[PDB]
Amino acid sequence: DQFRVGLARLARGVRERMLMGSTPAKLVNSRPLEAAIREFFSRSQ
Amino acid sequence: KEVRKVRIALASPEKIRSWSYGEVEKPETINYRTLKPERDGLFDERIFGPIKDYE
Amino acid sequence: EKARDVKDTSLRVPPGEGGIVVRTVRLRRGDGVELKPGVREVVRVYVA
Amino acid sequence: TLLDLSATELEQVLYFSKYIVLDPKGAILVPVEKRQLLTDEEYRELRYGKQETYP
Amino acid sequence: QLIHKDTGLIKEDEVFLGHIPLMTEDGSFIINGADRVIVSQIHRSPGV
Amino acid sequence: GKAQFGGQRFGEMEVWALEAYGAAHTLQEMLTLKSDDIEGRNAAYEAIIKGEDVPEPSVPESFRVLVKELQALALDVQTLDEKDNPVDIFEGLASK
Amino acid sequence: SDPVRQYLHEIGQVPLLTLEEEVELARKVEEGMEAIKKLSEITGLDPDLIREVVRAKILGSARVRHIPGLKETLDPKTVEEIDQKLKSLPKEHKRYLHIAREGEAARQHLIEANLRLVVSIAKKYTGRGLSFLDLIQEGNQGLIRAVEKFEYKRRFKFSTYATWWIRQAINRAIADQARTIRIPVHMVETINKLSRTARQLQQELGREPTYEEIAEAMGPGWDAKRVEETLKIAQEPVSLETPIGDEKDSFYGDFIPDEHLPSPVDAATQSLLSEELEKALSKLSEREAMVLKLRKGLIDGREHTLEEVGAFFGVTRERIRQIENKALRKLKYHESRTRKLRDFLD
Amino acid sequence: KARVYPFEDDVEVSTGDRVAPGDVLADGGKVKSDVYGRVEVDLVRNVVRVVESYDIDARMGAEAIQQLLKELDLEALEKELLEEMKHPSRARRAKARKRLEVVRAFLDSGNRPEWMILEAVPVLPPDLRPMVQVDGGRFATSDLNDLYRRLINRNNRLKKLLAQGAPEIIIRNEKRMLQEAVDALLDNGRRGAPVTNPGSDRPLRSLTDILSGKQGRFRQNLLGK
DNA sequence: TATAATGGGAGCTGTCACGGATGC
DNA sequence: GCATCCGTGAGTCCAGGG
Ligand SMILES: [Mg+2]
């Protein structure tokens, strides 16, 4: 479930860069995903 | 003297201006290189006082 | 006597603790080792 | 309580959802009484006039 | 893979997404050096 | 916290106990010389290491903090004397 | 309730310009600005003053404030005086006043009609440290700039020209406001370039890059130490009210000791020091004790020069130096005898 | 819905000007004003148009409320509510009493009603909302600094937008935002959604939060320490 | 500084007594 | 006035924190 939330944020970033721009890698910023997993594994109850 | 009572009341704009030692005009805090307070911002020694005693 | 330019900021055994030193780890920058920005070295001491 | 305004009315004025009149200067919408609450459409009518474009 | 609907152009790549923590043999995790357990949660089941 | 070389909490209920004993000076020490009365704590340490008796407490700092935080809420909180004349707990340091 | 729902409604009130209405308003703006220029030529007043008075009359006395560039406080009295100096002009000159008023009204209407384009641009700059509404307002500032700088003769639509200034104003705001410790714009650019470089390197490396790999990829001028120092300068503060643990029990601030005020131990050590220095000083004569005190600043906080202590005691600078030295000689002899000041030296 | 008035010479009123019946439009006063409205000088059509509208004074926001509160005469209102206390209906006596409690609180205190509106917002001394470098040189700071910075940015942008005569919609948005920023500084989450720092759901800690509750200044630092 | 571009996303869930506020 | 429908602030002590 936290992975799904991180992926949803990643997809929002993808759609954002799909509007502003002239590659899959260029379109994909992994940071939100990495942030969500980390947030799950460190600061969850 | 000796404290005997404690009053609480609305503060008027003029009362508030009398408290103030300066208007804070800039949203800055401290300078990112010197770590000293920016002028006219939230930590300005010009307004709120010196950071070091007598200096 | 000239006042020195550095002061003592050493790691000391806190009150009520102590024992035998059994390991030290020493990670210093410039050595497959990279620490968060601005720290030159970390030292860890294990006491049993 | 002081001004005899309800919670909804005070919100609508305070957060820019409705106007309130301090001088109707002889307006008419039954004329305009002081301390009356007019929507932006109503206030636009009374302050700038009625009009409409048709294609 | 990125497809432009009108051009038909298709670009494909393997992109790196970061890291996923692995469970050790005994069922725990190693998050920033410290062992951690994800504790199961009980809740009301979905349904009608 | 032990790691911060911390002090013990003398909470609301500990205060009630001292009040119920009428131990007024013990309690005033807990609230001033032993916590956040700055000149009080300095002067009490000095008096003890000199073998003198502890001085009379003055205002705790956290009440000064409370006054300033209420001033930020647009409230004027004034310590008066029996003739209703202001008393400055900030010793001039905050009046232009 | 929801302020952006409210603002989207207010914006949906004004309908969208047709090409014809667009061009008409832009034309009226250009010509009104030219008319203000001509009115300055005629009247000898200040084009800014005239623009402000025309604006004051178009807008109303509801919005009539002072302007920072104007040399004269814009007060209804002065705007009435200037409006009367204007209204007294001949018909062929007073023609330009009607031109200018028409221009200002067109300007307001052109902004208001293009408020939606700002929203459609600003919805894409979220999550970068500014609230949605804050981005909308900064973009609105960009739109105002656009309206004042547009040239309808070029036959480009307004949207094209306005998007450039709107992006300009949104990005300027993000880089001027997003950080609690404000960082100059060019440094923000360097920091963000460093971020993108690191991200490209990780995407090719399957892990995070070292300082050195980042330095390579940033090219010449960049070594590892400069990368590290930039990352250090980029660190944002963390909140004192950050929760420590599950409950609302404790906050990060709870564990931060005050390093500034002297501890009760330090204060008492300073006090025992002052008293022991006075004790040891009383073993000298009034003059050698006093000379030492003036020369070390133990009296008025500052250390006087030998010439000042000498002029005070009515004696040569050499004489005062010699009596300072014998005072020190006496202090050292006594201190070696009793060892009463040693422990204060650390 | 406008009234047209053709002219044959120089007109005495310019576009934007506001006019009441009996006002001198043009032709040396030959053409006058019939209806209340707003002047639009059409040079192409050579007519002085007047769109029918009153010069009504209706405001929004704390400026309006501050005016109305400045205007209150407390003695007069007290007299009226005492007259209201003689009413038969129990509910009207209830309402009059509740209002009169506030009226006489302001009367006996010496406070002014309008002081419930802020013009100058106070700023807490910086050592009560510190910016401190922890061990390691990294920085920690109170949420109040971010709440103040929001307020200051919104105010400064409002002063600039007023200088450029921005359209009303824009000023109204900015003013709504200024009210909410003051509201978040003083009592975050009381009206609306709480302000949070980016990348966190935690509400910033406001001045009200500092005083109240088991963790507030009173119970945590003044009734025990 | 100019092709043209014109209204957003997120929710979110097993409490309770009580003072004040809205419908009857 | 007479009920209902709302918001809101509250919940022992200590410790440590990952
Ligand atoms: Mg290099």
UniProtKB/Swiss-Prot annotation, chain D:
Family listed: Belongs to the RNA polymerase beta' chain family.
Function according to Swiss-Prot or TrEMBL: DNA-dependent RNA polymerase catalyzes the transcription of DNA into RNA using the four ribonucleoside triphosphates as substrates.
Identification of the protein by name: DNA-directed RNA polymerase subunit beta'
Domain of life: Bacteria
Lineage: Bacteria, Thermotogati, Deinococcota, Deinococci, Thermales
Subunit structure: The RNAP catalytic core consists of 2 alpha, 1 beta, 1 beta' and 1 omega subunit. When a sigma factor is associated with the core the holoenzyme is formed, which can initiate transcription.
Curated annotation (Swiss-Prot), chain E:
Family (UniProt): Belongs to the RNA polymerase beta chain family.
Transmembrane spans: none
The protein's role, per its UniProt record: DNA-dependent RNA polymerase catalyzes the transcription of DNA into RNA using the four ribonucleoside triphosphates as substrates.
Range within the parent protein: 99 to 146 of 1119
Subunit organization: The RNAP catalytic core consists of 2 alpha, 1 beta, 1 beta' and 1 omega subunit. When a sigma factor is associated with the core the holoenzyme is formed, which can initiate transcription.
Superkingdom in the source lineage: Bacteria
Naturally occurring in which organism (per UniProt): Thermus thermophilus (strain ATCC 27634 / DSM 579 / HB8)
Coiled-coil features, chain-numbered ranges: none
Record protein name field: DNA-directed RNA polymerase subunit beta
